[PDB]
C-alpha cells in the first residue's frame, strides 16, 4: 500500500507539471510541424 500511494503521488505530480507546460508544449509541437 505504501508503494501504491507513492506511485499515485508520483503520477499526479508528474501529470501536473505536464499540464502547466501543456499549452506551450502543443504550441511548440505545431511550430515544429510548421517550420519551413
Amino acid at each position: 500500500i505504501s508503494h501504491i500511494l507513492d506511485s499515485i503521488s508520483q503520477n499526479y505530480l508528474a501529470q501536473n507539471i505536464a499540464r502547466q507546460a501543456a499549452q506551450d508544449a502543443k504550441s511548440l509541437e505545431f511550430l515544429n510541424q510548421q517550420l519551413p
Partner: protein, 49 residues
Amino acid sequence: LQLLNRQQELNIAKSSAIGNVRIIDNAVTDPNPVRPKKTIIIVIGVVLG
C-alpha cells in the same frame, strides 16, 4: 512587418486550440447494472407480504 508578426501570433493562437474544456476521463461502462436493484426489490416484496 508589425502586422505580419501580429498575423503570425494570430495564426499560432488559432492552431493552439486546447482551451477551456478538457476531457479528463473518456466514458466507460460499469459492468454491474444499476437497475433493477435486486436485493432491495426482494426485501420490499417480503416486507410487503
